[model samples]
Target: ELPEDPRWELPRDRLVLGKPLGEQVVLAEAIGLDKDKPNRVTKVAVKMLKSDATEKDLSDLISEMEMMKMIGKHKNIINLLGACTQDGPLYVIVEYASKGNLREYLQARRPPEYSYNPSEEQLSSKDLVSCAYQVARGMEYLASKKCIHRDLAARNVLVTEDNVMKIADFGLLPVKWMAPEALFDRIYTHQSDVWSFGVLLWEIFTLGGSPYPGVPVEELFKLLKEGHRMDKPSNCTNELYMMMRDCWHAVPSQRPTFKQLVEDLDRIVALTSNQE
Candidate 1:
């Protein structure tokens, strides 16, 4: 039996994990090819296929893994450390993010979904501003590479030690924050990604607030087309809100590029920072 690999083929025996991370995924604690170092670890997240996976499911799984591998590495992109399938459950291993995804991270900082407290948020404005800038930088890289992250939102991003953020998760369809065209045609483009980025900024400024609080999901797409925008978050800067507005343009062509987002967000962040 031949081994499919990157660098050294990671054997099944090397993996040691706690209770599975998800129903079928786990944190593979022990990794790396070097026997010389007993404590050597790659610390990757391992996702396994269902026991009853069909050919179509397998095909889709393979496609997703291939795409993850092809996208490769960026500071703001999760990296595929390795993979294993033939030995047992099909596993897709990716670098671990200790701080969990951005959505959960933000939820912990913001007020309750139904309640906006007058004060006493554990988070600071600078941190929120930093998050917005970081996301733009990451998405700008995606745009430059001509890759569209079909799902771009707070929940789709992962954060690790020291406030580092990376985009993660995949395959969301017709959720809130989707662009007008994407809702209409089921199309995803870098432009559509920009539209979602606006919603993400809204989330950050509002401390993980849900989008369109009172809107029913079925009415949302039409409401978006009717030129309704999210109300300005209480703590967001005017300049930042304008950027969010620009990203929500009715015509995708009219939306500002992620490249522009980086510039404007950085400028606004600098001005709004108390630490400045």
Candidate 2:
């Protein structure tokens, strides 16, 4: 039986949608039309599916919805508002992240590399570290539930207009972020997610640079097998880089837990002043 959540199901007519938010999503206003009371229009994001999507595609989306509902109630995790799985195109409604994903956020703020000049509006040390800590906290919660993100990266992290970080989009496998066991043996644990979080940390400090730059996927797999890890970004501190290094431990068992990551990142933020 498909675990289609009936409680989150909304009728097709209740939604008034704008143009596609991207290729597969649209900005929608979920309307509550009650003649006796004032109309309520709530802003929401809806993930859409193509007419010819495969059975696996439909199953994966349903599985994702089930997984999100299982994770439940965490400040940094994305809120799954509702879904429309019946009738026309599949629509997964979610709380909108006003500022978009972290990768785009960082890239947009990245300074032109004419020199080492830092822009006044660029992300501060505090902002970067705090975001790292927030992601760690979210991962820690997922770990507690024995959930492996399988894909954890800056692109999957959403930012609010208030600068709060929210973990979004949990699906798929990307080789560059995989742990050694996950890369070769196809083994995935929360520890593997921790390993991916390290790569995500690198993505944050590098302002969204792809991990293992100049290396092909096959080369990255070979290097990772040989205990090689990415070097620190120019702006990242030695202390912070060490934490990232810890996540890339040769043995998956040796890698720090997400709880440890949360604590370590929290300590780093605490050690530094002028967060504002």
Candidate 3:
């Protein structure tokens, strides 16, 4: 799809360090070194399209990322530095995340290896709430800018060295978490984003547990059509649980605004920090 160039070459010496998506590559380490700031070396990660991808696919992906950036939602999103298209491959270079995805971080702390279904002890209430608060802040900013995240889940949230949460993986239409109108072919909006945010909260509380656990995709769809939702964990706080419920309400108008969500989280954060 992309225009061909003569300078394209597969990276041979780079180590593979993360979950690969299609032809896109995600590297964990930094690519180049700077002598002046030896300890502050920068890292690079890349996403490349397959040689046979259609022009429409390339356009859609690029447009999604570009639109997000233009909307100011890109700040807390992964930082895309530059891109190049050559020899049938389209490559995007980005800042590397050393800590990997939030799901991986949560699983590594578990004992009997990382099970898709994490136990209560594996994901504490405090840590879950903390992570949810950070993500809510990021989403709040995006909503303020009139942009919907579209895709907000535990796997998409990247943790930095300082434990800051950065939401990632937004290059597609948000189908699973769309509201009724959105599901009926309406455009994305803040209300649709609130629904996705509720799902993200569920993921955080469960430490990356799948939305339906053992439920099949078809069954999950049926339940969703029938107004069912995944339940919150017992240990989730009353305030946080109430917020999550309101976000996932069947009626879009019933959902709380991002501004309201942030205020609620700020109150919770202040109370929790005061205890510390």
Candidate 4:
């Protein structure tokens, strides 16, 4: 295949793509990595496009690979370090984030952890809001470059040792945070991504709980079609919940773009502070 196409590139020998990739955050666990350390873990994420992935789907995936490749740095978006094409599935090297996903991180703050000193939890309300803000910032940068994540949710958002949030998994992806239209007509647009962002917000405020809880997947479609949305999370603030609601509006046109999400969230971020 490589002999036929000049586009193929072999993965570096040290490059890893055949091991278990980290989830939301990288911990000492089953993960593929060239290097691993406590403070400095070089975790690489691998994405395998199905064997059936072909034509436009293949090209589009390559384009996304290129998009991440071009960005040298991002405080919020994960950095794509390298790629390997001489395999069954396309594998792109991605950064490692410790502490898992944002939802899990939020959950750890309560119950066992929350009962301890605020500082002991190692994060604050300010931290939570920062995660949201940083995600918005990351999405904003992607939007500015005309990239649509299609999946943006708490699970898809990774957290670092210091809790730096990076948008991941291409929209909770390979499915689910999908917009209503996506679920319906198999359509996905930037607006659909915004719609998932709302659900992600719900997951965030609730501390990594499952979205559409108690509702079966098959039923959710009919339910959402009837204008049903998740109830307000008890622990969530009015403004935060309201923003989530705005993201859930049925009309995709009514949703805020990631650019505006950054603005709106920044305004909210400014008013917040954590008391030490």
- Please report, in order, the local distance difference test score of every candidate based on alpha carbons: 0.76, 0.81, 0.64, 0.68
Instruction: List candidate 1 segments past 4 Å from native.
Output: 1-3, 33-39, 111-121, 170-174, 274-276
On TM-score, who's better, 2 or 3?
Answer: 2
Clashes in model 2: which pairs? none
Better of 1 and 4 by lDDT: 1
Estimate candidate 2's RMSD in Å.
Answer: 3.4
Residue-level lDDT of model 3, residues 134-171, one tens digit each, is 77777777666666666677777888776778777654
| All candidates in order of lDDT, best leading | 2, 1, 4, 3
Query: Which candidate tops lDDT?
Result: 2
Model 3: how large is the Cα RMSD against the reference?
A: 5.4
All candidates: CA RMSD (Å):
3.2, 3.4, 5.4, 6.2
Steric collisions counted per model: 0, 0, 0, 3
lDDT, candidate 1, 170-197, per-residue tens: 4212378799889889988888999999
Candidate 2 residue spans exceeding 4 A from truth: 1-6, 32-39, 114-120, 171-173
Query: TM-score, each model?
Result: 0.88, 0.89, 0.74, 0.74
> How high is the lDDT of residue 65 in model 4?
72
**Worst 10-residue lDDT window, candidate 1:** 112-121
Which is the winner by lDDT between candidate 2 and candidate 3? 2
lDDT of 3: 0.64
Question: Could you tell me the TM-score of candidate 1?
Answer: 0.88
